[model samples]
Target: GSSGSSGSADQIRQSVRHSLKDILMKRLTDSNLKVPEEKAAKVATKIEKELFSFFRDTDAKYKNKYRSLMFNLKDPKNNILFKKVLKGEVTPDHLIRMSPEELASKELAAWRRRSGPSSG
Candidate 1:
């Protein structure tokens, strides 16, 4: 059962990597790039290589933060909160400003709201 979970996680990692590449390609095509068709593929490969290197060079802490942020964003209940965060209406620094107790309280409230009626 534990191995099943590991297998799923690996699949998710591969799927995410594939989707990220698709996103980059879409963005490049949608942008104002003037490259010809034949050269565009080469340029995309070069950029993708550089992108991989950049991710490899990123700090572990920020990478963990990014993972946490993506997890939170995946929660439908946090849709509005994340929209505000994306828009810079509520900054990430604002979250860090809160004390642990305050953060816990906020999370508890959010969980309660998400859970509908309480049992017991």
Candidate 2:
């Protein structure tokens, strides 16, 4: 009358508790491998595909059920640099996501919103 499987509950708990930090640190380090622009784009695009594929695969070993951030790139397809800032991965950019004209006005607006002359 047994269910026919012998996987214990503690085994499941141990597997679930396995180091998530290792995965995160490995991926973060892998993100800085000095890839060429073309290569980096190709790998990034491939990673995107794999992530989507994981979402689609019903029988996937690890069925990730949470939403996560998708990074964008700047030199061509998308401006990942700005995306990084939004994600707090890096510091400020001089360009500010715009060119020549929109620069000063946008900055002034942001400054006024923060610097009310007496609010801290």
Candidate 3:
């Protein structure tokens, strides 16, 4: 007799992966991004939602590194710009994305530079 199986192991993995996406999006929005949209919240959600993408299956080494850093951010909602911009003062303010060899150097912390300078 033939038996029916729900899915394969890989299928299970795919399901779990997307499950993680929604789970993260839910918890993330509920944290600090919990805003009703006049479009603001949707923007925030997309920032977070996309940021939580692709944990692995790339340049293997980079995939791990990326996940490691993003997985351990300080603030919850701040994660939007937190992972996007590798700065101390992470906000929706865009500078540029650090990529490729950009990691081997530039550990420089970008503190809030909004009309302010060193306490000199």
Candidate 4:
């Protein structure tokens, strides 16, 4: 069996993604520029859409080398950030132009900033 993160999700996580995307589409319509309906389906998770695939692929490529790391897609905070971006709440403005190893690079670099070196 391939060990990539793209493996089929089980039922529990399956339903959760639906609920998330349900909310994802709600927020999307109010935020849309023009296209409707299909845009909601288009703006879904990494397995179903582009924005999130960036995050997941970032986790995959970088982790294959580290061997034990799961990267941002596995972290809750950034997971929420990815969810927010998926829902059109926050645009990854600084990152719209990045790709591949660049996102992998930043996701790790940003993970450090995400977890914070100094505890509050």
- Candidate 4: where is the Cα deviation over 4 Å? 1-9, 45-120
Task: Assess each prediction's global lDDT (C-alpha) against the native.
Answer: 0.41, 0.34, 0.38, 0.40
lDDT of 2 at 42: 36
lDDT of 1 by residue, 1-120 (tens): 364523343343344444434433444355443434433334324432443344543455433534444444344444443333333334444543334343323243443365545532
Model 4 worst lDDT window (10 residues): 62-71
Better of 3 and 4 by TM-score: 3
**Tens digit per residue, CA lDDT, model 4, 1-120:** 856747433442344345445654555454453545554444433332332344444444332422222133343443343344554543433334344354334333353354545622
- Candidate 1 lDDT score relative to the true structure: 0.41
Better of 1 and 2 by TM-score: 1
TM-score of 1: 0.30
The Cα error of candidate 2 at residue 75, in Å, is 22
**lDDT score, candidate 2:** 0.34
> Which residue runs of candidate 1 sit more than 4 Å off their true CA positions?
1-59, 92-120
Ranking by TM-score: 3, 1, 4, 2
Candidate 3 lDDT tens digits, 33-98: 443422333333433333334332334453354344334333343334432332223332222234
Tens digits of per-residue lDDT, candidate 2, 100-119, equal: 34322323335347545562
- Candidate 2 global TM-score: 0.23
Question: For each candidate, C-alpha RMSD in Å?
Answer: 14.1, 15.1, 9.0, 11.3
The CA lDDT at 73 in model 3 is 36
Instruction: Please identify model 3 stretches exceeding 4 Å from their true place.
Output: 1-24, 35-57, 74-109, 115-120
Each candidate's number of clashing pairs is 0, 3, 0, 0
